[PDB]
Amino acid sequence: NFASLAPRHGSRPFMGNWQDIGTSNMSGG
Amino acid sequence: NFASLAPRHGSRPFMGNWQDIGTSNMSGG
Amino acid sequence: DGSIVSSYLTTRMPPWAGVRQNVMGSSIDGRPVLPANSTTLTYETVSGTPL
Amino acid sequence: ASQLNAVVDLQDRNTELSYQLLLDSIGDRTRYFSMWNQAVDSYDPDVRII
Amino acid sequence: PRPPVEEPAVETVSPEGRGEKRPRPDREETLVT
Amino acid sequence: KTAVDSITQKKFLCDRTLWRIPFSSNFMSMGALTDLGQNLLYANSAHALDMTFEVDPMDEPTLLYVLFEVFDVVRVHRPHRGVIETVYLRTPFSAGN
Amino acid sequence: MTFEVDPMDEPTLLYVLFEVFDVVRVHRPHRGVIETVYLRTPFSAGNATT
Amino acid sequence: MPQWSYMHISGQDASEYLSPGLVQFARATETYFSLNNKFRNPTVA
Amino acid sequence: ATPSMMPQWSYMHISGQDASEYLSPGLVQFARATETYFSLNNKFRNPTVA
Amino acid sequence: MMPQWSYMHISGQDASEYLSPGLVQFARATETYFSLNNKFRNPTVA
Amino acid sequence: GLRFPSKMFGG
Amino acid sequence: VDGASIKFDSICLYATFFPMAHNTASTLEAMLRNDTNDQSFNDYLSAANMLYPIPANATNVPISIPSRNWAAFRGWAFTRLKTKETPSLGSGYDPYYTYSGSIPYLDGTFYLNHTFKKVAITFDSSVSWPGNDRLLTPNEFEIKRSVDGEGYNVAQCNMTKDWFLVQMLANYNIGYQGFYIPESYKDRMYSFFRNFQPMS
Amino acid sequence: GRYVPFHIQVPQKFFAIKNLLLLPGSYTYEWNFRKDVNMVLQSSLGNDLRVDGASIKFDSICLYATFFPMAHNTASTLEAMLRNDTNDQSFNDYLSAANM
Amino acid sequence: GYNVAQCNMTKDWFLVQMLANYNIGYQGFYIPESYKDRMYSFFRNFQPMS
């Protein structure tokens, strides 16, 4: 599950965004 | 659906948002 | 004074240096170390000979 | 109707520091607001550290 | 690092975090991106 | 070329701030209610506290301003017209009888 | 490529970035094993000669 | 009013009154050829 | 003072539900509609739990 | 060419797609205190 | 909105 | 003594009302009088604030909290003040407060943070906190050193590596995945790295 | 002063091992440091610091490493997930260029 | 006594100008954020004096 490792904002686990999983930055690319 | 015109972030097209097509910029409102 | 020493509650001794007594210490080679009440122990001081 | 004070204030609270630290987190603090006299105390950085 | 994104695949820019006029300061309410 | 035999002094000045020590198991902010405040040790039993501060000596009477960070919370109930009722509870250091 | 520069009375260099994908993929299959595969394209540092 | 709706002072937004192929074109090419400020959206109080 | 501190952490909203969850569903629906001109956001305590 | 660009993630799937779904669910939960975000390469394709 | 957590000092 | 004087002529209370519609302002009134819709706030500081006196040229400051519930405890935050620069606010008038400068107790203009050497926290007379061999000197919070021979300092100053790790994690969640400059919204005015200026 | 006993913390810049999350194991970690005063130092005139008497001497170098105190069942699950051949940590140099 | 900001601008007009530009004034006056407070706006340029 791995959702009990997240801080609970309320009663819901504050899960991070799916878009923050990889990096894409280069020198202008 | 013009998704071959979008830059692929990963395996999916990075399409924009529907609500960004217009403009409402006006002085004071 | 006439009072009893020590009439206050004694907190036990912290197990690190600079608390136990305020006597002038000494370095590992014998250089004089000033006490913990001194203003010169509010910064660090380092010595080094060049190449 | 009741005359019952809804402010139960405590002696070991610091409402002023609670409000000075609040305005740092909710807004820009270098800006000056004369109505609440919101002008933060700031030393000159070239006078403190020479 | 990356603007917010919905996932309908297609990859759609989400409008959250944008600046608005508010009667109350927006940092104490939301995160502004 | 005639530089004296010098000795280096190092220090820091950190104004305007409070030295935050969080009561969390990894010193991080994983939430406002930390994982050691929810611990079975610190919630299901009572503990003493003996803090010991070593400070620089000053030629002036100084104070020590420690913040014991609590949950200082009000809940305001207004059931009828002109009636306002507040219930206060801060935990740990509660001030109610 | 044919660069044309202003003249300077000093031996100068020319630092051209041939932009590539200097990418590493790191595999650690067992305890204490650190296997990496490096690849950049077009200007690869390994061909059949090595 | 039919003339506020013709000039888009009040009514549908550009995601709704435009042709759906143009909305999909302006949503795909937004990162390099933006068509967003070409069409007026109403903000109705 | 209580062996289970949860009934008064949930009462004072130290550990519990967000304001979308413990408020009445009409007030949450009201505060989302009037959010741009009459903010009810900071009137309610939202807990975060490690 | 194309089989090794997908291996080295020059062109292919993002880290939400090629990683195992247990690792993506881990990286979202621990995102605020133990970030795994800059450890994986996301290809952007023109 | 109403899901934003409350501002406290250091958490 | 210096002849300053303040005198109040006339004081008025002002109150700005949103001109809400009377069916909307009666619907909001009726919803906000329920027990489930009670307005609940918190103090931003959220702390019990205790002032312990330090004598002149005093190095060791021992304090104690006798035996309490420690549930929902959040942490510590400490700064040395001055007795001259801090009023007695429990009384309505402090005749022995002969000082009209900046009050660090109230203004937030703390400046004696550098005058701390180390802190030891022991729960229950034996349980040293954090314990668990966490720090490089795990039985104390070494804030700075006067003699470094084992090389435990950061930032080309005398602040230790334990205390720089703690303060970059207390404010910023920075330190287990490298030290770097926090982004400017986390790094506020009264924060650590905004104000930490090391010298030599 | 002219005579500076320094105490510096030097970061790691090589992109494959700059953001790498090492899984458990015993790793050797060897590195070469420069003593060239025209390379390790910067003057505001650009003068030759070998002729101009500048000299550096390294007493000792310590490698420091801050571990996250993760739970031993969580860090065993994260270890086991990151040893799959689909969960390989892949990095990219930010410049990403051949230099001629 | 109907003036704001330790100047002679009135309380009616300071309310209207902080609501015309920023939607600020029915839930307290504060410093607007810099993205709303542009160059040709009210609070960027309002300079009360004495």
Side-chain angles (χ1 to χ4, degrees):
Chain A
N1 194 3
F2 296 98
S4 66
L5 298 173
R8 290 185 296 272
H9 292 176
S11 64
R12 297 173 292 111
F14 181 73
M15 299 299 290
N17 291 317
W18 61 271
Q19 61 188 358
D20 293 331
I21 192 63
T23 185
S24 298
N25 49 359
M26 290 173 69
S27 179
Chain B
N1 53 358
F2 302 101
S4 66
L5 298 174
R8 292 190 300 274
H9 291 179
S11 64
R12 60 196 180 276
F14 186 69
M15 296 291 287
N17 198 359
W18 292 269
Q19 310 298 319
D20 288 330
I21 186 64
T23 185
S24 294
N25 197 359
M26 189 184 290
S27 179
Chain C
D1 195 1
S3 297
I4 297 299
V5 176
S6 180
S7 178
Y8 291 155
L9 184 65
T10 299
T11 308
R12 66 182 179 179
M13 186 185 74
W16 62 84
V19 180
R20 179 180 60 84
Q21 285 180 355
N22 291 318
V23 189
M24 292 180 69
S26 179
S27 295
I28 198 66
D29 53 350
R31 294 180 182 178
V33 176
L34 290 176
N37 297 118
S38 183
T39 312
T40 193
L41 274 75
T42 61
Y43 54 88
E44 76 173 3
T45 176
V46 287
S47 298
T49 177
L51 183 62
Chain D
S2 180
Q3 292 295 110
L4 186 67
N5 192 1
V7 174
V8 186
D9 202 0
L10 295 179
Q11 192 178 3
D12 53 353
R13 192 180 291 120
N14 199 358
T15 304
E16 300 294 343
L17 185 61
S18 177
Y19 186 76
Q20 292 292 316
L21 296 176
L22 178 65
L23 299 178
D24 196 6
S25 67
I26 67 168
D28 196 1
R29 187 57 175 163
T30 64
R31 295 174 64 88
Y32 290 164
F33 191 71
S34 69
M35 180 179 177
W36 308 126
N37 204 0
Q38 182 175 359
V40 64
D41 294 330
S42 67
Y43 60 90
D44 189 74
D46 293 329
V47 175
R48 179 64 167 169
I49 299 168
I50 304 171
Chain E
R2 190 174 189 178
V5 159
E6 293 179 352
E7 186 183 0
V10 296
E11 192 172 6
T12 302
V13 174
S14 179
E16 62 184 0
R18 292 178 179 176
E20 291 177 352
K21 286 184 178 180
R22 290 179 182 178
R24 200 61 188 161
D26 53 353
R27 182 171 169 84
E28 79 177 7
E29 294 180 354
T30 61
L31 293 172
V32 178
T33 56
Chain F
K1 67 180 182 179
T2 62
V4 298
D5 291 330
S6 68
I7 193 167
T8 301
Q9 295 180 353
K10 293 183 180 180
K11 70 183 183 182
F12 69 100
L13 261 59
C14 190
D15 295 333
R16 290 179 183 173
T17 194
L18 294 155
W19 292 119
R20 295 178 63 186
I21 300 174
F23 188 68
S24 181
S25 59
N26 51 2
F27 295 108
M28 301 186 79
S29 178
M30 297 183 288
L33 180 51
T34 63
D35 51 353
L36 292 179
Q38 286 173 343
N39 196 3
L40 296 175
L41 182 64
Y42 294 103
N44 289 318
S45 66
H47 293 91
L49 184 64
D50 292 328
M51 299 180 76
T52 302
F53 291 88
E54 182 177 358
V55 300
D56 292 340
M58 291 175 67
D59 53 352
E60 188 173 1
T62 59
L63 290 173
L64 178 67
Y65 176 56
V66 183
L67 304 184
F68 292 92
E69 294 180 353
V70 298
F71 281 91
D72 197 0
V73 178
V74 58
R75 181 169 177 175
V76 183
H77 188 198
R78 291 187 298 274
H80 296 91
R81 182 183 177 90
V83 175
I84 179 170
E85 295 175 356
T86 56
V87 175
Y88 296 14
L89 176 64
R90 68 178 186 182
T91 55
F93 290 0
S94 296
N97 292 320
Chain G
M1 300 178 74
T2 303
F3 290 90
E4 183 170 358
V5 300
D6 289 333
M8 290 175 65
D9 50 355
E10 185 174 359
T12 56
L13 287 174
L14 179 64
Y15 176 57
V16 179
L17 301 182
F18 292 95
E19 291 180 353
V20 296
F21 284 91
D22 199 0
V23 179
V24 172
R25 181 170 175 173
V26 178
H27 192 195
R28 289 186 296 275
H30 298 287
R31 179 180 175 88
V33 178
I34 177 71
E35 293 183 354
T36 61
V37 174
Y38 296 21
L39 177 62
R40 67 180 186 180
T41 53
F43 285 86
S44 296
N47 54 9
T49 63
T50 62
Chain H
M1 188 172 177
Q3 304 176 1
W4 293 353
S5 178
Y6 183 79
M7 300 301 290
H8 307 293
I9 298 171
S10 66
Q12 290 177 352
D13 292 334
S15 299
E16 294 178 354
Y17 64 83
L18 292 179
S19 64
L22 182 62
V23 179
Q24 294 294 321
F25 187 81
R27 190 175 64 87
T29 68
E30 183 179 359
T31 62
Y32 59 91
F33 185 75
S34 180
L35 293 172
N36 294 325
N37 55 359
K38 272 76 174 175
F39 301 101
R40 183 69 186 171
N41 286 320
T43 60
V44 163
Chain I
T2 309
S4 180
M5 295 293 288
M6 292 301 290
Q8 61 185 356
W9 290 357
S10 178
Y11 183 77
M12 301 301 290
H13 306 291
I14 295 170
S15 67
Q17 292 176 354
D18 289 329
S20 296
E21 295 176 353
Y22 64 85
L23 295 178
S24 65
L27 187 65
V28 179
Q29 184 179 1
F30 184 80
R32 291 177 181 175
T34 69
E35 188 177 0
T36 61
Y37 59 90
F38 186 76
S39 179
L40 292 175
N41 293 320
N42 54 358
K43 272 79 175 177
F44 301 101
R45 176 74 175 87
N46 289 319
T48 67
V49 164
Chain J
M1 291 301 294
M2 292 297 290
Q4 71 177 358
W5 290 357
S6 180
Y7 182 78
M8 298 303 294
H9 306 292
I10 294 170
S11 66
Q13 296 178 356
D14 290 332
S16 296
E17 295 177 353
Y18 63 86
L19 294 179
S20 65
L23 185 65
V24 179
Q25 189 180 5
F26 185 81
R28 292 179 64 192
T30 68
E31 184 179 0
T32 63
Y33 57 89
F34 185 74
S35 178
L36 296 176
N37 294 322
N38 53 359
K39 274 78 173 174
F40 300 99
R41 181 67 176 86
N42 286 316
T44 63
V45 162
Chain K
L2 296 178
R3 291 182 181 175
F4 184 74
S6 295
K7 299 293 286 184
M8 290 179 70
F9 181 73
Chain L
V1 179
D2 289 330
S5 178
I6 185 169
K7 181 177 70 66
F8 297 109
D9 289 332
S10 60
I11 293 174
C12 293
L13 176 69
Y14 290 153
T16 305
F17 288 87
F18 182 76
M20 193 179 290
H22 298 285
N23 54 359
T24 300
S26 177
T27 304
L28 180 60
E29 178 182 0
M31 290 186 287
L32 287 174
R33 294 189 189 278
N34 292 323
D35 198 8
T36 182
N37 295 321
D38 292 335
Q39 299 180 0
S40 57
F41 304 95
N42 54 356
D43 189 71
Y44 182 76
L45 188 61
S46 292
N49 309 323
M50 296 180 182
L51 289 172
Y52 294 95
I54 304 170
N57 297 114
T59 302
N60 196 7
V61 183
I63 68 169
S64 179
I65 302 300
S67 182
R68 292 189 61 87
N69 194 6
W70 291 100
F73 186 67
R74 291 179 62 244
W76 292 275
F78 60 95
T79 300
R80 193 174 185 180
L81 299 178
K82 287 184 179 180
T83 307
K84 182 176 174 64
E85 299 182 354
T86 299
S88 295
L89 295 178
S91 296
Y93 179 70
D94 198 4
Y96 295 147
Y97 181 65
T98 64
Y99 178 76
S100 69
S102 69
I103 305 171
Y105 180 77
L106 298 175
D107 298 333
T109 60
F110 300 106
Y111 63 97
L112 293 175
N113 285 313
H114 59 276
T115 60
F116 284 97
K117 290 179 182 177
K118 63 184 75 175
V119 177
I121 299 167
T122 62
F123 285 97
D124 207 1
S125 295
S126 66
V127 182
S128 179
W129 191 78
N132 291 320
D133 199 2
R134 295 300 184 191
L135 300 172
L136 288 163
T137 61
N139 288 316
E140 64 192 4
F141 286 93
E142 288 181 351
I143 297 170
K144 69 182 183 180
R145 291 187 178 181
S146 68
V147 172
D148 195 4
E150 294 176 352
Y152 287 115
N153 291 323
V154 294
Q156 307 184 7
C157 66
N158 51 358
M159 177 179 281
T160 61
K161 297 198 167 71
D162 286 328
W163 188 252
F164 189 76
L165 179 61
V166 172
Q167 293 296 316
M168 290 294 287
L169 288 167
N171 293 109
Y172 296 142
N173 296 116
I174 291 175
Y176 296 116
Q177 291 179 352
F179 294 102
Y180 59 94
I181 295 169
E183 291 180 351
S184 296
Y185 64 95
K186 294 190 289 184
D187 184 71
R188 294 291 186 179
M189 181 176 288
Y190 297 109
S191 294
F192 174 69
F193 179 67
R194 174 72 63 184
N195 294 315
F196 173 70
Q197 301 304 114
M199 290 171 284
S200 294
Chain M
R2 179 180 173 180
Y3 294 151
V4 181
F6 61 96
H7 191 281
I8 56 173
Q9 294 85 20
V10 190
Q12 177 61 254
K13 297 179 186 179
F14 186 72
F15 68 100
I17 62 171
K18 181 176 68 66
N19 292 321
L20 185 67
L21 183 70
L22 281 179
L23 297 172
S26 294
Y27 301 98
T28 191
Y29 184 66
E30 185 178 3
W31 192 264
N32 285 307
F33 294 91
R34 291 190 181 93
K35 290 177 72 176
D36 195 3
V37 297
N38 290 321
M39 293 299 292
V40 306
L41 292 175
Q42 179 183 2
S43 66
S44 68
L45 274 72
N47 51 359
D48 193 3
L49 291 177
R50 300 177 188 177
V51 179
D52 288 328
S55 179
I56 189 168
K57 178 176 70 67
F58 295 116
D59 289 333
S60 65
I61 299 180
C62 292
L63 179 67
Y64 288 157
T66 306
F67 288 179
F68 182 76
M70 195 177 291
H72 295 285
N73 53 357
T74 299
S76 177
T77 304
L78 179 60
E79 177 183 0
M81 290 185 288
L82 288 173
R83 295 191 189 277
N84 293 324
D85 51 352
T86 185
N87 293 320
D88 294 336
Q89 299 180 2
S90 57
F91 297 100
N92 193 359
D93 190 73
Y94 183 77
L95 188 62
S96 292
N99 292 310
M100 295 181 186
Chain N
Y2 287 121
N3 291 322
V4 295
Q6 304 185 6
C7 66
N8 52 1
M9 176 180 281
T10 62
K11 294 199 166 69
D12 287 329
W13 187 253
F14 186 76
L15 178 62
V16 171
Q17 292 296 315
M18 289 295 289
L19 288 166
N21 293 112
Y22 305 113
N23 299 118
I24 292 174
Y26 294 116
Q27 292 185 354
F29 295 104
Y30 60 93
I31 294 168
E33 287 86 3
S34 296
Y35 63 92
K36 291 189 287 184
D37 184 71
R38 296 291 183 180
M39 180 178 287
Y40 294 101
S41 295
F42 173 70
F43 182 66
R44 175 70 63 186
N45 295 315
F46 173 67
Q47 304 295 105
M49 291 177 285
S50 294

